[PDB]
């Protein structure tokens, strides 16, 4: 396996598996500090899903919330985790998203997701790729089918991996006193692009469902 | 060449004297005029008309309108005109206070836009008064 990413992705997935039990740990009808964030993020899933997917947003609530909150916790492990002293001879210790493979996995997941919706809910024989509006629109089918997953992934992946490198490229020259607005802009936009992959996934499901 | 300044309101005309220098505010800002400006039509907001006839530039208030600065003529069509010195500054200022109070009360949309209107027109009455 590609170890340099997998080793740290294991402990980030451990953070995920613990947040899986955070649900069943504390029941609060009125959630005070911290859990109100959980309810607000559930509301955020409601927002993006009901806004873009359409009707069967709720069985896709899991599939959108997973990538959204996972980009959240991976931004956490990338920047906000104190990792100055730790040293690995296998490679840099930045984030789970350091490898292309995680983002192409999210890509294929979203792709087969809207393909699944468009094959089940619509007909099996033909879906939006079939050339109904104008029968000479096969280049549109080819291009969009070929470009959606990989660049869908690249949109997030580029910024996240770029900052994951830029942080150590900055510390290699100047200590942490200078790179901190860079950390700020990164922690700013890394959750936005999480939202972006989420809403574009949702829009592709809506395309499949229409 | 020479122009005429004839303000006129929905009841009558409150000026017909041929003046030298009119400078009135507009929605876009201010425009100044001296004899024979080019043909022009300028929407004039609620701003004083400090009319500099040679020796005396006396303040005139107006409460919204329109203007036409064509050849040898300046027609000022406003809802109401008032020479600045006509209004007492004490009651002018007290009505400025009541106007600000009206906008303070006016949380509603209808009442608040009409009160903003009344406010601005009352404040310009103050500014016309003591000058």
């Amino acid at each position: 396996i590609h170890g340099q990413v997998l080793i740290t992705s294991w402990v980030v997935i451990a953070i995920l598996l613990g947040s899986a039990a955070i649900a069943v740990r504390s029941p609060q009808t009125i959630p005070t500090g911290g859990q109100n964030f959980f309810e607000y993020v559930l509301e955020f899933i409601r927002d993006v899903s009901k806004t873009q997917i359409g009707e069967e947003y709720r069985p896709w609530v899991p599939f959108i919330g997973t990538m959204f909150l996972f980009i959240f916790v991976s931004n956490w492990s990338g920047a906000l985790l104190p990792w100055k002293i730790i040293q690995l001879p296998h490679g840099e210790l930045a984030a789970p998203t350091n490898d292309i493979n995680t983002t192409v996995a999210l890509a294929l997941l979203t792709s087969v997701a809207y393909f699944y919706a468009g094959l089940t809910k619509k007909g099996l024989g033909y879906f939006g790729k079939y050339i109904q509006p104008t029968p000479i629109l096969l280049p549109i089918n080819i291009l969009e089918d070929f470009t959606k997953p990989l660049s869908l992934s690249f949109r997030l992946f580029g910024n996240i991996l770029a900052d994951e490198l830029v942080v150590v490229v900055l510390v290699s020259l100047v200590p942490l006193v200078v790179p901190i607005p860079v950390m700020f802009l990164g922690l700013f936009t890394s959750g936005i692009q999480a939202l972006i992959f989420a809403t574009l996934a949702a829009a592709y499901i809506g395309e499949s469902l229409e | 060449m020479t122009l005429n300044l004839c303000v006129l309101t929905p009841n009558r005309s409150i000026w017909n004297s041929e003046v030298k220098e009119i400078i009135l505010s507009t929605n876009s800002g201010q425009i100044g005029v001296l004899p024979n400006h080019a043909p022009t039509a300028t929407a004039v907001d609620i701003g004083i008309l400090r009319i500099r006839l040679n020796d005396q530039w006396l303040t005139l208030a107006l409460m919204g309108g329109f203007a036409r600065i064509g050849n040898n003529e300046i027609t000022i069509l406003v809802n109401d005109a008032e020479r600045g010195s006509d209004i007492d500054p004490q009651e002018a200022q007290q009505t400025l206070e009541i106007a600000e109070a009206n906008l303070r009360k006016a949380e509603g949309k209808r009442q608040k836009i009409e009160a903003n209107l009344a406010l601005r027109r009352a404040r310009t009455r103050v500014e016309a008064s003591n000058t």
Binding site: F154, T189, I192 | -
Partner: protein
């Protein structure tokens, strides 16, 4: 070798040639949407979500060149 020199020229000029477009784009977009937030203040969020999605779409453009520059610099399959 000379491969290092030309590759480094590329790693320098790539992000510089990238960063110009989304500059003017983000500028006009932010200006217009903020004038809209001024015009109708209550529509702040309905302006802001759309502006933000466009903004991230523009960040992707420049980040293509940044990724090319970084993959050229450190993880270089040539040098």
């Amino acid at each position: 070798p000379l491969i290092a020199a030309a590759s480094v020229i590329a790693a320098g000029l790539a992000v510089g040639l990238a960063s110009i477009g989304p500059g003017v784009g983000q500028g006009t977009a932010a200006g217009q949407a903020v004038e809209g937030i001024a015009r109708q203040p209550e529509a702040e969020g309905k302006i802001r979500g759309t502006l933000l999605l466009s903004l991230a779409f523009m960040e992707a453009l420049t980040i293509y060149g940044l990724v090319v520059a970084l993959a050229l610099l450190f993880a270089n399959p040539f040098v």
